[PDB]
Every structure is written in structure tokens, then in C-alpha cells.
């Protein structure tokens, strides 16, 4: 069976505009600009709203494998709209048993230094993705705040920090040390 059409329409807020070039989406909002292409997916992109900016994606004659990509793009566009208007803020908590984790933020929040994870003298230097700003919060005792436009880059940057602080040759169930992501919040809370 090949479905004739599996469309899905997203809604663009008026404060942000979208310009389409082929299958490349350009999102221009208050918090910055985001570009992401979708040439790897054979879809038709249409802009319905000259008045309220409805964006429609269409797939013609697709099988069950490729109708899943239709909403996959739609979620990506919603993430782009979310980023350019609210931004993604990730909170990571450093947990430890006896050796307190020491975190030093380098220039512009683009580089993070982890000093005394599990009490070993090795110094971990994890480099964030461009456009992602990390910082030590003043809100709590152990919190790292990662703010950036793209959820792709921010969550990837946070996961790099978490995977770096990985216990080895020990019972990971008992040894609970490591920096873990707590919540996936936003900025400006609008």
C-alpha cells in the first residue's frame, strides 16, 4: 500500500518568519537565525499563510517507512521555532560521593574543565559546539547551564560532558558519580 498523501501542517508565530529555498529552511527570529536543510528527504514544502504563516509539508506515494519522516521534519521545524524564540536551556547536576567535582568555565563558555572527577589528577577538557554557551549557575550548589539556539547542538554538547564523566572498571550501580542532565528547560520562560 502506498498512501496518496500524508500532509502535516505546523503553525509559525508572527514574530518569526520562515523563508524556504528548495528543501532548506531558514528561520529568522528574535533570538537568532537557524538554517537546516532536508535534501535527504523527498518532501514538498509549502507556505500557506500570507496572514498567519501556516507551513505545510507533503509526501506523495510513500510507504510506511517514509511517512514517518513527515512528522520528523515537523518536529524539527517546531524545534527551530522554539529555539529562535525561547532557546533551549539544559541543567546538568554534578553528583559525587567523596571527591567533589570541580568545574571551571573557560572563555565565552565554549570550553569546560573538569578537575577532580573521582579524585584522579587527569584534567578533562570538553569543547562545546559553536553557538552553545555553558556556564556555572548561581542558582544551586552544583548546576551547569547550557544555553543555545539548536536543541541538536545543546543536547549533544551536554551529552558529551556526561559521557566524559564515565566510571570505568567499577560497579556503575554503586558508583553514582558523574554529571547528569536534570531537566530540559527553556530561556525567557515565555
Amino acid at each position: 500500500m502506498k498512501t496518496i498523501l500524508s500532509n502535516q501542517t505546523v503553525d509559525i508565530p508572527e514574530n518569526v518568519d520562515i523563508t524556504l529555498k528548495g528543501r532548506t529552511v531558514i528561520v529568522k527570529g528574535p533570538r537568532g537565525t537557524l538554517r537546516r536543510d532536508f535534501n535527504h528527504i523527498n518532501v514538498e514544502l509549502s507556505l500557506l499563510g500570507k496572514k498567519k504563516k501556516r507551513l505545510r509539508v507533503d509526501k506523495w506515494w510513500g510507504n510506511r517507512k517514509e511517512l514517518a519522516t513527515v512528522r520528523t521534519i515537523c518536529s524539527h521545524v517546531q524545534n527551530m521555532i522554539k529555539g529562535v524564540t525561547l532557546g533551549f536551556r539544559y541543567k546538568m547536576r554534578s553528583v559525587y560521593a567523596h571527591f567533589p567535582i570541580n568545574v571551571v568555565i573557560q572563555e565565552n563558555g565554549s570550553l569546560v574543565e573538569i578537575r577532580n572527577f573521582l579524585g584522579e589528577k587527569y584534567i578533562r577538557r570538553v569543547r562545546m559546539r559553536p553557538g552553545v554557551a555553558c556556564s556555572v549557575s548561581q542558582a544551586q550548589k552544583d548546576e551547569l547551564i547550557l544555553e543555545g539556539n539548536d536543541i541538536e547542538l545543546v543536547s549533544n554538547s551536554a551529552a558529551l560532558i556526561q559521557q566524559a564523566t564515565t566510571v570505568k572498571n567499577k560497579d556503575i550501580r554503586k558508583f553514582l558519580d558523574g554529571i547528569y542532565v536534570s531537566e530540559k528547560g527553556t530561556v525567557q520562560q515565555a
Binding site: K2, I4, E44, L45, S46, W61
Partner: protein, 139 residues
């Protein structure tokens, strides 16, 4: 993106098959590969036809699906397509292709004489314009 859609009343062009080079109209669609096709004014009775020998044109007719040939014939006659089709670039390109193919040896000779003279005058004018545009000396 797309502008030409397979739909009831769409006028298609028969590239190949037993009815190649004719205009047809779609009555209904079947099995995502064929359709009910009936062009009455182009001398094509109603029959199934695959989409691989269909090229979508820019003309869509207004009649209900699975209508009889009488309604389609009136829909083809009223708001006629024959005059509209022959005025398009697409038809005359096909028309020019036909007369080029059947151009005779003497007709080939006359064109070559015509092509020889026309190219020389135009190339002379281009040379005239080239030196005309050669009078440029500006900081």
C-alpha cells in the same frame, strides 16, 4: 512545488502507445498506475491507459468523475482546447518537429541557403555591436 496534478478533467498528452501524439482527458483513476482516459474530440474512445505514457498539460476540465462521453465531449467543445492547444508553444514545437522530419532534400537545400545568409548578417551585426561596445574607456 508541483503545479500539474493527476485529477479528473486534467488534459494529458500521449507521448507513446497506440495513440501517440494525441490529446486526452482523464475521467477516473485506478490502481495508482492507470486511469480511465477518454478524449472524444481527438478521436480516442474511452479506455484504460497507464501514466507512463501521460504528460500532464496545463488544462483541466470541469465535469464529475465517471461521467459519460457526452458530457466530456461537451466539456471539451465548450471552452474548447483544440484552438487553445495549437496556440501554445508545446504544440508548435511538436508541429515544427514534424515538418522538420519530413523536410525534403530540395527543402534541405533551400534552408541551408537561408541559414547561410541569415547567420552571416547576424554575425556581422554582432561584430558591429562588439566594436560599438568597444568604445569604453572609463576609470
Amino acid at each position: 512545488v508541483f503545479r500539474r496534478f493527476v485529477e479528473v478533467g486534467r488534459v494529458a498528452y500521449v507521448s507513446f502507445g497506440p495513440h501517440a501524439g494525441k490529446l486526452v482527458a482523464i475521467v477516473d483513476v485506478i490502481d495508482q498506475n492507470r486511469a480511465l482516459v477518454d478524449g472524444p474530440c481527438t478521436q480516442v474512445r474511452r479506455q484504460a491507459m497507464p501514466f507512463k505514457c501521460m504528460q500532464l498539460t496545463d488544462f483541466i476540465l470541469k465535469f464529475p468523475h465517471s461521467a459519460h462521453q457526452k458530457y466530456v465531449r461537451q466539456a471539451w467543445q465548450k471552452a474548447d482546447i483544440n484552438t487553445k492547444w495549437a496556440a501554445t508553444r508545446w504544440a508548435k514545437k511538436i508541429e515544427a518537429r514534424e515538418r522538420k522530419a519530413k523536410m525534403t532534400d530540395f527543402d534541405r537545400f533551400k534552408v541551408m541557403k537561408a541559414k547561410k545568409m541569415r547567420n552571416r548578417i547576424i554575425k556581422n551585426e554582432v561584430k558591429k555591436l562588439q566594436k560599438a561596445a568597444l568604445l569604453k574607456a572609463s576609470p
